[PDB]
Amino acid sequence: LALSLTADQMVSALLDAEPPILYSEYDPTRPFSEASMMGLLTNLADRELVHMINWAKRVPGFVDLTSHDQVHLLECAWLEILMIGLVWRSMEHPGKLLFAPNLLLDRNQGKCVEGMVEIFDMLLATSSRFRMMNLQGEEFVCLKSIILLNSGVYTFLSSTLKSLEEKDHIHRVLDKITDTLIHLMAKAGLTLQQQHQRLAQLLLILSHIRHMSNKGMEHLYNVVPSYDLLLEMLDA
Amino acid sequence: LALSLTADQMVSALLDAEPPILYSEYDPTSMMGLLTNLADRELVHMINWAKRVPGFVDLTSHDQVHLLECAWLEILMIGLVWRSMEHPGKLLFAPNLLLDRNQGMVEIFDMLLATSSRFRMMNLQGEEFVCLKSIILLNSGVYTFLSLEEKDHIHRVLDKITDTLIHLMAKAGLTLQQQHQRLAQLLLILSHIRHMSNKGMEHLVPSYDLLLEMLDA
Numbered sequence: 088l089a090l091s092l093t094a095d096q097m098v099s100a101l102l103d104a105e106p107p108i109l110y111s112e113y114d115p116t117r118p119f120s121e122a123s124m125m126g127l128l129t130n131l132a133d134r135e136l137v138h139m140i141n142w143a144k145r146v147p148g149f150v151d152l153t154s155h156d157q158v159h160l161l162e163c164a165w166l167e168i169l170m171i172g173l174v175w176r177s178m179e180h181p182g183k184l185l186f187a188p189n190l191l192l193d194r195n196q197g198k199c200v201e202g203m204v205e206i207f208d209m210l211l212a213t214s215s216r217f218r219m220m221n222l223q224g225e226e227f228v229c230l231k232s233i234i235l236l237n238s239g240v241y242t243f244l245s246s247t248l249k250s251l252e253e254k255d256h257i258h259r260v261l262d263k264i265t266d267t268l269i270h271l272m273a274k275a276g277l278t279l280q281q282q283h284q285r286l287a288q289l290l291l292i293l294s295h296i297r298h299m300s301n302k303g304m305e306h307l308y309n310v311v312p313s314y315d316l317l318l319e320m321l322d323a
Numbered sequence: 324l325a326l327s328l329t330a331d332q333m334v335s336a337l338l339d340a341e342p343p344i345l346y347s348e349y350d351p352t353s354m355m356g357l358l359t360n361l362a363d364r365e366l367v368h369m370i371n372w373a374k375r376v377p378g379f380v381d382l383t384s385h386d387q388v389h390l391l392e393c394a395w396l397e398i399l400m401i402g403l404v405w406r407s408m409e410h411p412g413k414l415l416f417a418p419n420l421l422l423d424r425n426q427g428m429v430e431i432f433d434m435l436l437a438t439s440s441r442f443r444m445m446n447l448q449g450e451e452f453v454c455l456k457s458i459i460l461l462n463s464g465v466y467t468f469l470s471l472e473e474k475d476h477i478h479r480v481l482d483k484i485t486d487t488l489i490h491l492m493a494k495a496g497l498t499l500q501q502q503h504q505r506l507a508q509l510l511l512i513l514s515h516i517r518h519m520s521n522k523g524m525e526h527l528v529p530s531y532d533l534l535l536e537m538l539d540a
């Protein structure tokens with residue numbers, strides 16, 4: 088069904104799939120320790136992951152894949168998706184990151200846990216970049232869907248006829264989301280040149296999000312969701 | 324002048340700046356020794372290649388070093404994927420150093436093979452390749468501060484390379500829809516190259532000061 092959707096049907100489907108805004112654990116002890124703020128962030132992320140899977144299952148084309156391929160897309164993309172959500176939430180709070188409505192953190196609280204101010208600075212620069220570009224909500228949901236479908240696709244096996252069918256399918260859906268982004272920009276009134284340029288600028292920011300996600304795992308070096316956990320939530 | 328270049332001038336300039344394909348040191352008639360020595364010599368060519376990317380030398384030396392520091396392994400890797408594209412299942416590190424999976428950390432070499440396979444399926448063209456390599460150079464470090472004038476300039480050059488890619492595809496006969504779809508497909512592969520670079524880096528060298536002396540000289 089996904090490949091039959093027009094651009095406006097794709098946008099509406101992506102807007103309606105958006106997950107809820109969650110709150111941080113209420114009234115933690117402030118100031119934080121390294122241990123306590125990692126604890127609040129982990130608990131927030133663990134609760135967001137559940138709604139991430141519900142969102143994923145509503146991204147057109149995602150459910151057509153095997154459960155195994157779905158779990159690998161989520162394994163590769165989950166932190167990037169959490170991060171892009173954080174960046175989108177933070178756009179109108181320059182210099183700060185809005186993890187939840189009740190957990191707004193500035194740069195110098197990032198210094199709390201070792202290794203995290205560097206990622207805070209990158210997250211803040213991405214939020215400024217999105218503010219610079221006047222990123223639109225309809226563009227943001229297309230980007231988040233691209234992250235989900237693209238980040239793990241290069242890891243499909245190609246061993247079998249099916250694996251090529253799975254990976255050709257993802258690329259067809261990614262093509263449709265590209266078409267949808269372009270359609271939104273033409274409907275805004277951008278010229279053809281401006282459309283191609285904005286498309287490239289948005290997709291190039293996705294390589295920075297991938298970088299920050301990689302950087303974050305590396306400073307971390309068992310809080311990442313396991314295959315079995317992601318599979319069980321997918322089947323639930 | 325970089326902002327005044329036509330699409331055909333951008334491609335010409337990048338094609339003319341392309342480094343040669345280097346050989347491994349083997350003499351007959353260690354794997355890392357060989358790869359390190361190869362990368363060592365490719366980096367010397369990379370620095371002088373970067374100075375010829377339109378708009379790059381307009382930046383302060385500090386910003387030039389910051390971009391090279393962030394992109395050097397991505398650049399080596401995209402060069403390897405390009406070379407290996409017509410050798411399915413193998414990585415052509417050099418014409419005399421062609422390795423298969425067994426000879427390989429293996430994870431990165433599975434990822435490199437998947438990238439080469441993707442470029443093969445898309446019939447990636449040499450003119451598109453040089454464009455993508457320059458995008459890696461200019462884009463990988465820009466969000467890490469490479470101030471405001473520098474960042475704007477870089478974005479105007481990136482917009483020119485976008486125009487160049489679109490022009491190439493229009494001249495190859497692609498429809499407007501195909502042009503934007505292919506642009507997106509090529510740029511999404513850069514996210515995977517960034518990931519392979521990060522992984523290789525964290526499985527494990529040129530410092531900030533090394534790159535600046537190399538680029539001073």
Ligand code: NI
Nearest residue numbers: 158159162314
């Ligand atoms: Ni796995």
